[PDB]
Amino acid sequence: SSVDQKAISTIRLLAVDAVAAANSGHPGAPLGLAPAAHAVFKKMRFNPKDTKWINRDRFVLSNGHACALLYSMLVLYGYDLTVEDLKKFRQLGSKTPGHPENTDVPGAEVTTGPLGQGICNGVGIALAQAQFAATYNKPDFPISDSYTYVFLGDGCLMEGVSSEASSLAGHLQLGNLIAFWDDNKISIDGSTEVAFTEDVIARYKSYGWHIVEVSDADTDITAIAAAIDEAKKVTNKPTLVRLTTTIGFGSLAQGTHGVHGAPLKADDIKQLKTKWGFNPEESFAVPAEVTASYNEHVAENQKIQQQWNELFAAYKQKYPELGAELQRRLDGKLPENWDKALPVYTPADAAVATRKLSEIVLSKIIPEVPEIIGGSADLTPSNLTKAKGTVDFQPAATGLGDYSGRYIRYGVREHAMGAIMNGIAAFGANYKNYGGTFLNFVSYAAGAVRLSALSEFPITWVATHDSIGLGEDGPTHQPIETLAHFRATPNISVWRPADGNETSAAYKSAIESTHTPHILALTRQNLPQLEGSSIEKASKGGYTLVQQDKADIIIVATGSEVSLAVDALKVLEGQGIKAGVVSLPDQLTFDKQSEEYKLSVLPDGVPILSVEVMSTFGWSKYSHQQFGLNRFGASGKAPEIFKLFEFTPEGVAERAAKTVAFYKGKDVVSPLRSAF
Amino acid sequence: SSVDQKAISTIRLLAVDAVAAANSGHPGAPLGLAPAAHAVFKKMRFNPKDTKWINRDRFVLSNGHACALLYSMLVLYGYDLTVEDLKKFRQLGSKTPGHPENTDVPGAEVTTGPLGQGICNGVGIALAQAQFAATYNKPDFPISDSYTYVFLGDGCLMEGVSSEASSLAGHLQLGNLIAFWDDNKISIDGSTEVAFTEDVIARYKSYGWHIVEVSDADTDITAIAAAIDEAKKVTNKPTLVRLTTTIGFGSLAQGTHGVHGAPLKADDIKQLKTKWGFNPEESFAVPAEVTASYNEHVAENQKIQQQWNELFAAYKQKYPELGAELQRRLDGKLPENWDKALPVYTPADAAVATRKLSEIVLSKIIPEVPEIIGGSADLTPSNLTKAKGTVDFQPAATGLGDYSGRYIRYGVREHAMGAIMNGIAAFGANYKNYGGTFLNFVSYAAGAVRLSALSEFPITWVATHDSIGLGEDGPTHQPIETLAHFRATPNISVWRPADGNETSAAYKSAIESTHTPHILALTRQNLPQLEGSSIEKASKGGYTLVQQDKADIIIVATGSEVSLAVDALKVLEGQGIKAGVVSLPDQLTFDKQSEEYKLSVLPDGVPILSVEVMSTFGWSKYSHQQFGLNRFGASGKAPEIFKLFEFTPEGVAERAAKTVAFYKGKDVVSPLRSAF
Ligand SMILES: Cc1ncc(C[n+]2csc(CCOP(=O)(O)OP(=O)(O)O)c2C)c(N)n1
Ligand SMILES: Cc1ncc(C[n+]2csc(CCOP(=O)(O)OP(=O)(O)O)c2C)c(N)n1
Ligand SMILES: [Ca+2]
Ligand SMILES: [Ca+2]
C-alpha cells in the first residue's frame, strides 16, 4: 500500500485488463515481471517526449509476448501511448500490436516477439554505445554513458541465437549491458523440467558474465534496485540478474502454463483487483498517485537531458570538429559529398571479383564516413570486409583492439551477427553497419534478417561466394533458393552487382538507406568491367546495358550472368538474332522506379529471357522465360560447373533462340503489365 | 614407427595429397585430428561392406571442411571409396566432394559442411538409438547398443544450433553420445582469442555433459582411447572429449590460420613426408602394413555383425511379433495397409482447423506405425503434435518419460530440432519423424531444413499458424516469404492442405517418403470440408476441385484460400462469369505428375488466377495472374485482416473479373508451357 506497491499493482492490472479487452494475449509474464519493470524504469534515464535522446538508457523486452507490460509502462510514463490505445491492444490498426514493433510503438527500441532476438539486439545497442562513447567522449564530456537493460525469459535462453550473442558480449566485456532473466520455471509445454534443466547461471559465468540472483523477485524491488547498482559497479562484464518469479503472480492460475498465453477468467481478475485494493468493477484504472510518482521521475530525467544538451553545446565549443560530426550524425545526415569517395571503373580496367570490389569500396568510404562499422562471422579473409589500417572493436584490456575500433570479429555466429546489427542500427546516431558471411549462410540468420526488414533498419549483409561460381566447396555452400527467399521478403534490397560501377552503386544505396536493409550478393570469381555500366544507371536498380532498337529478344541478368548475357549476344548475332541486355542489380530499387522508367527497360513487344544461376522464383516479374538453376550445385572447378549446367554463351544463346521461336506469331506485352 | 604411428602418418599424408591434387581444400584439421580419427575408428564397430548394419557405431564429422580426413579413413578401411577417388577430391562428379554428402559418399552418415549441423545430427542419431534400443532390446537380446562419435571444431561450438542441441542432449542423458572437440585455438579469422574466449568446458558441464581432457592429442592415442573407455562408463551423460591439438600438425605452417583452408606448399609436403618416413617423391602412399592392421579390425567387426545377425534370428524366434516388426523396418517397409488408419471426411462434416486435423491424423497413425516419433519446439498445445496416451521421450531417471517414449519436448530450439530430425532419419530403421513449430519460425531452422533436402531425408515439419489467419499475434508471427523460400529449395514437399481429406493426403505423402522432406503448413483457424476433395485426388499434389467445362477463368489456390475460391466462384456466377477451381496442396508432388495430368488440371485456353495469402513468388509456374500478399501482416482479429487485404469472396471475384477482361482478345496457353 505504498505508492511503489500501488504502481506495481497498476502495471499488473493494466496488462491484465488489456489482455481481457482483446480476449487475446499473454498475462503471465506481465504479472510476474511488473515489480522488476517498475524497479528498472525507476533507474532508467529517458524522456517520453524525446524518444531519440542519444544518451537515454535503452530497454528491450526480448520476451516480446509480454508486451502488455511494456505498453503499460509507456502509458504510465506519458509516452505517446494512452489508456485508449491499451483498450485497443491486439486490434487491427492500433498502436498496441500483439508483439512490439519499433515502427509503430513509441518507446519500443526494436521489434521483438521472435524469441532470442531482443537480447541480441541489446548486445548490439550496448556494442554501439561503447563504440560511440569511445569515439566521442572526452575529459569532462561524458557525451555517452548510457546503459542497456534487457528482459528475457526461458524461451530466449533456449534459442541458440542468444547463446551466440551472450558468448560474444562476454568476450567484449560489455559492462553497460544488464539483462534480467524471468526465472519462472514455466514455458508453453509446462515445467522447464521437461526440456530446460541446464545450469543457466553456470553457463553465463562460462561466458564471462557477472551474476546477481534475486530470489524473491515477486516482491523484492529493493533487491532488484540493488542488483542494478551492483551491475553498474562491474564495468568489464555484462550482468545477468536472475529474477525468480511466479508466472502469473497473483492469479488463481499463477505458476501454471495456462497463465502464459491466454486471457484470465473474469472471476480471477476480480480477486486480483480486490486483493490489491482496486475496484473489481473497474478496468484500466490509473491511480493519480502513481501518475504523480512517475511524473516526478520523468521531470528529473528531463532535467538530466537539459543538462546533457548544455554539455553537448560546450562540447561543440571545445571540440569543434568532433562536435560538428556528432551533430551531423544526430541529424541523420551523411557527410556532404561522401559518395565522391566511391570507386569508379571503365571498361578498360581489369576484371575483379565483386568481393574484392567491395573491399576496395570499404577501404575508400570507411575513412570518409565515421558512422560505418562492421565485421564478419569468421570470414574476414574470404569476405574481404576489413579495411587495412583499421583497428578491431575489442575491450582494450585484451590488447586485441579498442572500443573505438571499427571492425567486429563476430566469430561463427551469423544469426547473432544479424540481430546485433539490428541493435547497432537501433542505437541510432546514423550508424551504417555491416556483416559479412557467405551468401548461403545468411540463411542461418533468417530470423534476424526478416526483423531487419520489418523494423526498417538500414543494415547491410556483405554476402560473398554467391553461387556455383565459388566452385569446389560444393552444394552445401552454393546458394540456390537464397535470393528468392530474401527478395520475397518485404523491404529487402538484394543487390547482385555485376562489376565495379554496380558495386559502388550497391554501396551507395546501402549506406544512404534509412529504412531498408541490404544484402549484397558478391562473387568469389573475377568479372569483367562492363561497357555501359555506371553508378548513375545502376542506382536505378535496373537499367538497359545494351540497347538494341530492333531487338528480337532482351536478356535480363544480374551479377556474374550479365557478362554471360553480353557474350551470348555475340553468339546470337552469328545466328541472325539481335539481343538487348538489361542489368538488374536490385529488384526492389527497380520496382520503386516510375512505371515509365521501368517500361523503358522492359518494354512491350519483345520477348524477355532472364538469366541468373539461382532459383527462377520471382523472375517472371521481369521476364517471359527464365533460365535459372533449380537444383543443388556440385563440387568442382567453377567453370566446369557452369559448363555442366549450360550457363555458357552458347547455352544462353540456345535458350534465347528457343524463346524467340516460342513467341513467333504471338503478341507479347511487358512482364510489368498485370490485370490488377 | 609403430604400425599405429605409420597409420596416422598415412592418414595425414593421404589428406594432404588429396588437397594438393585438387589445389583446393582444408589440410589443417585433418593433420590435427588424424591421431584421434585413428583411435576412434579402432574403437568403432562398422562393416565397410554393409554401411547400413543397424547396430554399427556411427561417426559424424561436424567440422565437414576436414573431409579429406574422413575420406582417407573410408579408403583405408575398404569402404566403396578408393585412392583413385581421393585423387579426384573436389573434382566435378567425383565421390569425394569438398564437403561430405551422405547421398554420394559411402560411410558418410549425414551431410556436413555448414557448421554446427553435424553435432546436432549426432544428437539425433543418439536419440534414435536410445529410442530404438528401448523399443526392441530384451533380456539376453542387445539388439541395439551402439555409440555415436562426433568430431567438431571451434566453429561448431560458436554456432548457436550446437548450444541448443547440447543443452537438450545433456537434459536427455544421452550416454552413448561421445563428442570430440578439436581444441586448436585457431579459426579462419586467426586466434580464438579474438572472438571465442568462453570457458567451453564449464559450459558443457552446465548442460550436464561429462568431460575428458586430452592435453596432448597430437600424439597421445593411448589417452584418446582411454577417454572413450571412460565415456562408455558414464551411461547417463553425453561426453565431450577436449582434444588439444595443433592445427596443421607437422606442417611448417602448423598453428596458423593459413593452414586451415588452403593447400600446403610443395616443400612443406616434402618435409612432412621425410619427417614421417615416407618418400617425398610419392603421393597417395598406402603402406601395406597399415592396410593389414585396418583389415584385421574390419574382419573382427564383420564377425561381430555375423554374431548380431544370429542374435537377430534368435530374437525373431523368441519375440515373433517384435522380430517381424523389426525386420519390416530394416527392409524399409511401412506396415501393410497402414494408410487405412488415415481419417476420411465428407462435405457434411464440420469445419476443422488443419492443425486439429493433423492432431487427429497423428492420433490414428501413431498407434499403427511404431517408427513414427516426433515432437514440438515448446508449442505442443498450439501445434497439437502429441497423441493422447503416448509417453514422452525422456530418461526414466527423470520420472517425466522413458526412452521408449514417442514424443520429444524439444524446447524453444527450432534449428536444433531440425538438425536432430535429420539425425533421427539418418539412424535408419524406417524412422518417420516430425517436429512442430509455427510456420514463421521454421525459418529459424533454415540451415538444417536445406540439409534435409540435400541429404534426401524424409523428415516432416508440422508447421501450424500458417498465415495472417493466426490473427492477433501479428506480423512478427505471420508468414509471407516462408513458403516461397522452401518451395524454391530443391527437393522440399510443401503441403498446404485445405481440409480433412487433403490433410490425410499430406500425411500419407510425408510418412511414405523415403527421400524428400515435408513441410505441412497448417491453419490456426477452422476451414470447411470441401465438396470434391479426397485423399486420392489430393495425393496428386494438384487436382481439379470444381470442373467447369465452359470456364472463363480457373482459380488455383491452396490451404485456407481454396474455400475462399469456392465462395468467389459463387460471386462470379452472379456477375456472369463461370469459374473452375484447382486445389494445389503440394507443388512438388504436382510437378512430378505426368505432363498430360498436369495439363488436365491447368489447361490451355483459359486464364488462370492464383490465390494464396502469402508471397506471389513461384505462382507464375501455375497461373497467369497472382493474387497474394507481398507485404507484412497486421495485429488484429483474423477476419478483419483478410477484409483489410481484400482476401474476401468479393475481392477475389473482382480480381478474377479483371483477369478475364485483361485476356479478352488474347490467346492464352497454359502456364505449364515453356520455350525450353
Ligand atoms: C522463435 C520463436 N519460436 C517460438 C515462439 C512461440 N512462443 C512464444 S512465447 C513462447 C514460450 C514462452 O516461454 P518463456 O519465454 O519462458 O515465456 P513465459 O511463458 O515464461 O512468459 C513460445 C514458444 C516464438 N515466439 N518465437
Ligand atoms: C554455418 C557456416 N558458417 C560459416 C562457414 C565457413 N567456414 C568453414 S570452416 C570455418 C571456420 C573454421 O573454424 P574451425 O571450426 O575452428 O576449424 P579449423 O580451422 O580449426 O579446422 C568457417 C567459418 C561454414 N562452413 N558454415
Ligand atoms: Ca518461462
Ligand atoms: Ca579451430
- Binding site as annotated, residues of B: 26, 65, 113-115, 154-155, 184, 186, 260, 355, 382, 414, 441, 465, 473, 524
Distances in Å between the alpha carbon of B91 and those of A469, A472, B415? Answer: 14, 7, 31
Ligand 2 contacts CB of residue B183 (under 6 A): no
Residues A305, A308, A309: CA angle, nearest 5 degrees: 90
Neighbouring-strand partners of residue B190: B187
- Domain boundary assignment for chain B: 1-327, 328-539, 540-676
**Which of the residues of B are catalytic?**
414
* CB-based burial label for B287 (10 Å; 0-12, 13-18, 19+): middle
- State the Cα–Cα distance between residues A426 and A111, nearest whole angstrom: 10
Beta-carbon contacts of residue B132 (< 8 Å; ≥ 6 apart) = B54, B143, B144, B427, B429
Neighbouring-strand partners of residue A608: A554
Taking the Cβ of residue B380 and every Cβ of chain A, the question of whether any pair is shorter than 8 Å is answered with yes
Residues B291, B293, B299: CA angle, nearest 5 degrees: 95
Specify the DSSP element, H or E, that contains B8.
helix B3-22
User: Which positions in chain A touch B410 (Cβ < 8 Å)?
Assistant: 195
For B240, list phi and psi in degrees, rounded to 5.
Answer: -110, 120
Q: To 10 degrees, what angle do helices B160-171 and A160-171 make?
A: 110
Grid cell of A156 as nine digits: 530466449
- State the Cα–Cα distance between residues A58 and B292, nearest whole angstrom: 67
Resolution, Å (one decimal) = 1.0
List the single residue in A with minimal CA-CA distance to B393.
Answer: A194
Report which of A6, A18, A8 is spatially closest to residue A269, judged by C-alpha positions: A18
Grid cell of A315 as nine digits: 562540447
3-state helix, strand, coil in chain A (%, to 5): 45, 15, 45
Ligand 2 contacts CB of residue B114 (under 6 A): yes
**CA A257 to ligand 1: nearest atom:** 19
Grid cell of A414 as nine digits: 551469423
Question: Whose CA is closest to atom 23 on ligand 1?
Answer: B378
Report which of B485, B477, B517, B508 is spatially closest to residue B358, judged by C-alpha positions: B508
What class has domain B328-539?
A: alpha beta
Other beta carbons less than 10 A from residue A513's beta carbon: 18
User: Do B409 and A195 make contact, defined as CB atoms within 8 angstroms?
Assistant: yes
* B256 C-alpha to ligand 4 centroid (Å): 10
User: Do A658 and B676 make contact, defined as CB atoms within 8 angstroms?
Assistant: yes
The DSSP output letter for B237 is S
Neighbouring-strand partners of residue B586: B495
Distances in Å between the alpha carbon of A280 and those of A277, A661, B119? Answer: 9, 78, 54
User: Which positions in chain A touch B412 (Cβ < 8 Å)?
Assistant: 115-116, 154-156, 158-159, 187
Q: Count CB pairs under 8 A between chains A and B.
A: 363
Amino acid present at A67: C
Ligand 2 contacts CB of residue A410 (under 6 A): no
Strand B526-527 to strand B352-353: parallel, antiparallel, or no bridges (unpaired)?
antiparallel
User: Do A476 and B114 make contact, defined as CB atoms within 8 angstroms?
Assistant: yes
Specify the DSSP element, H or E, that contains A94.
none
Other beta carbons less than 10 A from residue A275's beta carbon: 11
- State the Cα–Cα distance between residues A238 and A664, nearest whole angstrom: 68
User: Do A474 and B168 make contact, defined as CB atoms within 8 angstroms?
Assistant: no
Question: Whose CA is closest to atom 21 on ligand 2?
Answer: B29
Grid cell of A204 as nine digits: 553465463
Inter-residue long-range contacts of B356-361, CB under 8 Å, 24+ positions, other chains counted: B356/B384, B357/B497, B357/B499, B357/B500, B357/B503, B357/B504, B357/B522, B358/B384, B358/B385, B358/B462, B358/B464, B358/B503, B358/B507, B358/B520, B358/B522, B359/B384, B359/B385, B359/B387, B361/B503, B361/B504, B361/B507
The DSSP output letter for B263 is P
**CA B63 to ligand 2: nearest atom:** 15
Per DSSP, chain A holds a count of helices (H) and strands (E) of: 25, 20
- State the Cα–Cα distance between residues B67 and B108, nearest whole angstrom: 10
User: Do B675 and A625 make contact, defined as CB atoms within 8 angstroms?
Assistant: yes
Other beta carbons less than 10 A from residue A337's beta carbon: 8
Specify the DSSP element, H or E, that contains A275.
helix A266-275
- State the Cα–Cα distance between residues B27 and B17, nearest whole angstrom: 9
Grid cell of B172 as nine digits: 536427455
- Looking up cell 569500396 gives A361
**CA neighbours within 13 Å on the CB side: how many for B57?**
22
Grid cell of B239 as nine digits: 561426453
* B656 C-alpha to ligand 4 centroid (Å): 58
Taking the Cβ of residue B516 and every Cβ of chain A, the question of whether any pair is shorter than 8 Å is answered with no
Distance from chain centroid for Cα B87 = 30
Pinpoint the alpha helices (H) of B456-594: 482-487, 500-512, 535-538, 560-574, 587-591
User: Do B484 and A485 make contact, defined as CB atoms within 8 angstroms?
Assistant: yes
User: What is the rounded (10 degree) CA torsion for B628, B632, B633, B635?
Assistant: 180
Other beta carbons less than 10 A from residue B333's beta carbon: 11
* B242 C-alpha to ligand 4 centroid (Å): 12
Other beta carbons less than 10 A from residue A393's beta carbon: 23
* A583 C-alpha to ligand 2 centroid (Å): 34
Amino acid present at A497: P
Neighbouring-strand partners of residue B212: B241
**CA neighbours within 13 Å on the CB side: how many for A189?**
28
List the single residue in A with minimal CA-CA distance to B471.
Answer: A90
Residues A544, A547, A550: CA angle, nearest 5 degrees: 135
Ligand 2 contacts CB of residue B152 (under 6 A): no
Taking the Cβ of residue A262 and every Cβ of chain B, the question of whether any pair is shorter than 8 Å is answered with no
Cβ contact A386:A371 at 8 Å: no
Strand A186-187 to strand A190-191: parallel, antiparallel, or no bridges (unpaired)?
antiparallel
A540-676: which CATH number, 3.40.50.920, 3.40.190.10, 3.40.980.20, 3.40.50.300?
3.40.50.920
CA distance B214 to chain A (A): 20
- State the Cα–Cα distance between residues A459 and A511, nearest whole angstrom: 9
Cβ contact A553:A660 at 8 Å: yes
Report which of B273, B260, B462, B215 is spatially closest to residue B356, judged by C-alpha positions: B462
Pinpoint the alpha helices (H) of B87-152: 117-136
Name the catalytic one among A371, A414, A502, A612: A414
User: Do A474 and B113 make contact, defined as CB atoms within 8 angstroms?
Assistant: yes
Taking the Cβ of residue B435 and every Cβ of chain A, the question of whether any pair is shorter than 8 Å is answered with no
The DSSP output letter for B46 is -
Cβ contact A621:A587 at 8 Å: yes
Q: List strand residue ranges (DSSP E) for B140-214, in order.
A: 148-152, 177-183, 186-187, 190-191, 210-214
- Identify the three-state secondary structure at position B529: coil
Amino acid present at B184: N
- State the Cα–Cα distance between residues A279 and A13, nearest whole angstrom: 11
Report which of A33, A48, A74 is spatially closest to residue A217, judged by C-alpha positions: A33
Distances in Å between the alpha carbon of B153 and those of A124, A673, B115, B200, B427? Answer: 26, 52, 9, 12, 23
For A653, list phi and psi in degrees, rounded to 5.
Answer: -60, -40
194-233 of A, contacting B, C-beta below 8 A: 194-200, 202-203, 205-208
- Identify the three-state secondary structure at position B522: coil
- Interface probe for A, chosen from B119, B174, B473 (most Cβ of A below 10 Å), is B473
Strand A625-627 to strand B148-152: parallel, antiparallel, or no bridges (unpaired)?
unpaired
**CA neighbours within 13 Å on the CB side: how many for B181?**
25
List the single residue in B with minimal CA-CA distance to A24.
Answer: B472
Q: Which of A167, A400, A627 sits opposite B198 (nearest CB)?
A: A167
- State the Cα–Cα distance between residues A499 and A356, nearest whole angstrom: 10
- Identify the three-state secondary structure at position A191: strand
List the single residue in A with minimal CA-CA distance to B101.
Answer: A476
The DSSP output letter for A153 is -
Cβ contact A182:A210 at 8 Å: no
Looking at the structure, give the CATH architecture of the domain made up of residues A1-327: 3-Layer(aba) Sandwich (3.40)
User: Do B412 and A155 make contact, defined as CB atoms within 8 angstroms?
Assistant: yes
| Deposited experimental method | X-ray
